[PDB]
Amino acid sequence: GIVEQCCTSICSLYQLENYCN
Amino acid sequence: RGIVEQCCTSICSLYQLENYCN
Amino acid sequence: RGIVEQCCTSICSLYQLENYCN
Amino acid sequence: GIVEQCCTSICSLYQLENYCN
Amino acid sequence: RGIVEQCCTSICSLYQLENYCN
Amino acid sequence: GIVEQCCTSICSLYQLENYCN
Amino acid sequence: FVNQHLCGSHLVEALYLVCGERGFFYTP
């Protein structure tokens, strides 16, 4: 999910956007 | 003009913060 | 009405933030 | 104390309140 | 008088925060 | 630099000031 | 004057501690 993706590994700008509605 | 001015007295997107980096 | 309204133009306790979770 | 209790182990809502006057 | 007053309605340096510690 | 100095080891008040202009 | 953008920075931070385990949606 959110935490699995960005806190465990390297995150990105245009995909923590993925989490925007 | 200036980050101080342009991001306090109106809101700023992530692209105009990219105007003020290094 | 709304968290935006009700927690910016007057202060909010920890019980009305519990109104707005998931 | 405060740090021993909540930073080392699991903290709680109604007892970090304990620290309120 | 008071940190609340003196650091919200005018800005505060690191030496007047040192007035309010423990 | 900045991160090498204060995040890896113990930092100080009057030298993170060093980073002021 | 009370600011839409700046105030919302603390609201999302507080909802992180208040909801915590369950989760939360935000729409401004």
Place this chain on the structure above:
Amino acid sequence: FVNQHLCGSHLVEALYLVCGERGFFYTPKT
């Protein structure tokens, strides 16, 4: 943009910038 790591409240704080005019959903469930 910062391409390393982003944990705690800072993960939620970044979602307020990145989205902004959209809002964000935060679901941690394992």
Place this chain on the structure above:
Amino acid sequence: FVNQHLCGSHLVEALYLVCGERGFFYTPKT
């Protein structure tokens, strides 16, 4: 409420919400 972990300034930041109308004491001495 968040039942895990709360370190650094976030430990102090949470004490501002939880107490609020009361205030908080923060004593770290070992």
Place this chain on the structure above:
Amino acid sequence: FVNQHLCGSHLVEALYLVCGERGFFYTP
């Protein structure tokens, strides 16, 4: 308009760095 609650969020954060090792009391 300058807000009692929001401003105080940075005051408690700053007192964490300024006092540091010694400690601090807060009363609003």
Place this chain on the structure above:
Amino acid sequence: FVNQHLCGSHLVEALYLVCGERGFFYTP
């Protein structure tokens, strides 16, 4: 009323995420 000091606390925090790897200067 919109405050020089307090608003700037979020500006320096955001520039940390926006610039990130490259770096940034600040002058108020």
Place this chain on the structure above:
Amino acid sequence: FVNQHLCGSHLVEALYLVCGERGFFYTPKT
């Protein structure tokens, strides 16, 4: 002053207090 550790955004946040009327430069390049 806090004589331990100061990482993430809090390292940048402290540079806003310490300098204040001067501003700060933040260069992380290895």
